[PDB]
Amino acid sequence: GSHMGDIGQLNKDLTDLRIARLQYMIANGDDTAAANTLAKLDAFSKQQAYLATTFKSPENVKLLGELGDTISAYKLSLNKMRQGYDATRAARVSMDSSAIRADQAMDALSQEVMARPEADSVRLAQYQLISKARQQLLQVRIDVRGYIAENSSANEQAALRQLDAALADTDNLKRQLPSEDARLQQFENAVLAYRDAVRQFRDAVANITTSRAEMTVQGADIVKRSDALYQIQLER
Amino acid sequence: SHMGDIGQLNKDLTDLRIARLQYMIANGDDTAAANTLAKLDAFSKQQAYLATTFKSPENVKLLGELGDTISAYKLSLNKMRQGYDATRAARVSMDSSAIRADQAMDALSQEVMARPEADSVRLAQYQLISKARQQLLQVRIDVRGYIAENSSANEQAALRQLDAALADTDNLKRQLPSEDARLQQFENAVLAYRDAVRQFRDAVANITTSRAEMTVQGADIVKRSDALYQIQLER
Numbered sequence: 001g002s003h004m005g006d007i008g009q010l011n012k013d014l015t016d017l018r019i020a021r022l023q024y025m026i027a028n029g030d031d032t033a034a035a036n037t038l039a040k041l042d043a044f045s046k047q048q049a050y051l052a053t054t055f056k057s058p059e060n061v062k063l064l065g066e067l068g069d070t071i072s073a074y075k076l077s078l079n080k081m082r083q084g085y086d087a088t089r090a091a092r093v094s095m096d097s098s099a100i101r102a103d104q105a106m107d108a109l110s111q112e113v114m115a116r117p118e119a120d121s122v123r124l125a126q127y128q129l130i131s132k133a134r135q136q137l138l139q140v141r142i143d144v145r146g147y148i149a150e151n152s153s154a155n156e157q158a159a160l161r162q163l164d165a166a167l168a169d170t171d172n173l174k175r176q177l178p179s180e181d182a183r184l185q186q187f188e189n190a191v192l193a194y195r196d197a198v199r200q201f202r203d204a205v206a207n208i209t210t211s212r213a214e215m216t217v218q219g220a221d222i223v224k225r226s227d228a229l230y231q232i233q234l235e236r
Numbered sequence: 237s238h239m240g241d242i243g244q245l246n247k248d249l250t251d252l253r254i255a256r257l258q259y260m261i262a263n264g265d266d267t268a269a270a271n272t273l274a275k276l277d278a279f280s281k282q283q284a285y286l287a288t289t290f291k292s293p294e295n296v297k298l299l300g301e302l303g304d305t306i307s308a309y310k311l312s313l314n315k316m317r318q319g320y321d322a323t324r325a326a327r328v329s330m331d332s333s334a335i336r337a338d339q340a341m342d343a344l345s346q347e348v349m350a351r352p353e354a355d356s357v358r359l360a361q362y363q364l365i366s367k368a369r370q371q372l373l374q375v376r377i378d379v380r381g382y383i384a385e386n387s388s389a390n391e392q393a394a395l396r397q398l399d400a401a402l403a404d405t406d407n408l409k410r411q412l413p414s415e416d417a418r419l420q421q422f423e424n425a426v427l428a429y430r431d432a433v434r435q436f437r438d439a440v441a442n443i444t445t446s447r448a449e450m451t452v453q454g455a456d457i458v459k460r461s462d463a464l465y466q467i468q469l470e471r
């Protein structure tokens with residue numbers, strides 16, 4: 001009954017892989033957890049390969065072949081999820097740096113105005129406008145971070161609309177303060193890059209969700225075939 | 237046939253472990269909580285069923301041990317659920333306190349313009365009001381960073397930055413002695429916000445604790461279930 005035992009080891013390896021992959025997502029797809037998942041996958045793959053050499057009956061060797069095919073597909077889906085998580089990380093890094101660049105551009109502009117020898121009433125009006133723009137972008141960051149924490153289409157779309165509204169108002173501000181165009185453009189270009197990064201984060205979340213949906217199917221398929229190997233052995 | 241019955245038990249167990257992790261991935265939302273509760277009593281039911289049909293004393297005791305761990309698991313899962321509820325409550329509280337603070341700061345900056353004074357003084361005042369506004373906005377960004385990624389580093393950075401905001405809000409009253417009432421209103425709201433960040437932090441701790449407990453319970457349940465399975469196999 002040793003072969004029945006071998007299948008026990010395989011089915012345990014499967015559960016362990018499924019648990020590991022969910023842990024990986026819980027850990028926000030971090031590199032440490034990715035290592036652990038890759039390990040559980042290799043343990044499961046190694047055991048499939050091992051039994052492919054030791055089982056002898058044609059229907060068993062074939063079922064093991066089928067299991068091996070799904071394991072190959074699973075490795076590809078898992079790779080896509082990993083690329084997905086890397087892309088969300090890269091996007092977040094890009095958002096942080098683009099935001100800082102934007103704020104610094106407004107920071108430099110505000111102190112360039114506080115330095116100017118023009119009328120106080122003029123400086124006051126200008127400072128009010130600039131601060132309103134800085135704070136609008138900060139609220140956009142709050143919305144985007146809300147979306148990063150909770151990836152709903154509702155949070156996505158709200159963030160995207162509010163970001164476009166800030167870009168629109170930045171266009172307008174350029175017309176209102178033409179003397180400061182050079183600076184406003186620094187700002188706007190950074191906000192445009194920030195928007196590119198938010199879109200990249202959104203697209204990466206989609207790829208993660210797609211891969212997950214794929215491994216859900218593969219897991220169900222692997223469970224099915226491994227169950228069938230088990231039943232054959234039990235029948236002996 | 238009893239071997240098959242344990243088969244069902246072991247499958248229900250896996251389905252429960254899978255469901256509970258899905259629950260956490262779903263940010264502990266009520267829909268996935270419902271699904272987890274459902275997998276839990278499917279497994280509980282199978283334990284209870286088998287407790288009536290298995291006859292060997294050693295099997296019956298194994299099923300009783302399983303049942304005890306199920307009872308503990310339900311309590312831990314309940315603690316996790318309460319934690320997610322608390323994180324959600326704290327977030328609601330953070331949002332409302334932030335809005336209240338911002339409105340107080342709006343009313344402060346707009347009964348500043350209604351007062352007759354020099355423009356240079358008006359420019360100096362708006363500079364520090366805006367400085368305080370943006371400071372709190374940045375704190376919210378830090379706190380949302382923490383909500384997305386619950387690290388000790390993110391936690392502590394947010395807490396420090398929040399304490400610096402409260403410190404500067406005391407200083408702002410020194411610089412705008414005329415507006416002490418309104419700044420106190422602002423300060424109250426930021427203190428309440430801090431209370432809420434701390435409440436969120438404590439609830440995360442409780443989720444983590446219950447998670448660690450269910451990890452242990454799961455390994456205990458797997459062990460006992462495997463033992464039932466081996467008895468049938470050697471039979």
Ligand code: NA
Binds near residue numbers: 421424
């Ligand atoms: Na009050």
